[PDB]
Amino acid sequence: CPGESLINPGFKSKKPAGGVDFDE
Amino acid sequence: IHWPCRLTIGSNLSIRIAAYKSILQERVKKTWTVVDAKTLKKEDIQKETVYCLNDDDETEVLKEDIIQGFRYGSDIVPFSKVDEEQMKYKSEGKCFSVLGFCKSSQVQRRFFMGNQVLKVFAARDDEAAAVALSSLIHALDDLDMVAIVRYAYDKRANPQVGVAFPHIKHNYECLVYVQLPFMEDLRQYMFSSLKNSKKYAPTEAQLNAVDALIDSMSLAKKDEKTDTLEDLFPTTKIPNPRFQ
């Protein structure tokens, strides 16, 4: 399934923590 | 007890605030004290803990002879308390900082964490702080926004990321702070859908029956369809049965 992690199958792949990024 | 601090937006803006704990789970002020069966005195009993090795002879190791270690996969990594204190994450305490402002829709109610709710007021006997906080609250309410903030009770308290949202009432207005989750506390579980399931789809008669059940068991009543609603079973006003 798209978005499945390549390290731990069966778990959603967490996007990297980006913190606060102000919008334009 | 009031908690004083400064709400900071950058390094130039600072508003003096006082925080109180509004809602928290309440426990018994006193605890059961274990007393001797016959003498009924607390002085007559004593509790202590002893550590012994896993060898057959069952050696005795004193309290000063133990060092704390952790587990790294299939091994054990010694990590003394002093070394941990040296390497521990150090922070500057008593922070109420505004990381940012975000739309209310983005902060859902099912992600709230923690065991407390804080109410943030302006500092006592300070007109300027009151005006500043009122300005911020009204701006957030008009824009339909909340403030994502960093919170640390003291130097040794782990920093937290939470949401402060406005709360305006006729008598008083205040910010309400509730904790928010880190990345580590989120659980990614997948559940089967119920709308698309073929074998669990209810029929129309079942839906009508459940509609009748919901209608019959309503716990609120409209005031003659005139002004507003009224609650028939207000649970917030029921004392806790445990203490009774």
Binding site: - | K47, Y51, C52, N54, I67, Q68, G69, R71, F182, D185
Partner: protein, 51 residues
């Protein structure tokens, strides 16, 4: 995935449906420390008693 508990929701004294309770947000704690022997560096078993 693991169910905290499996309970019975009772609409009445006769209508009961089985449900499961899960937690979608759980606080993350450091793994608990384990005591170790300073000399040989092997785990030590702990016990408590009252007298």
């Amino acid at each position: 995935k693991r169910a905290l508990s499996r309970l019975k929701l009772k609409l009445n004294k006769d209508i009961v449906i089985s449900v499961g309770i899960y937690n979608l947000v759980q606080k993350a704690l450091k793994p608990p420390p384990i005591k170790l022997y300073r000399e040989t560096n092997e785990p030590v078993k702990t016990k408590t008693r009252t007298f």
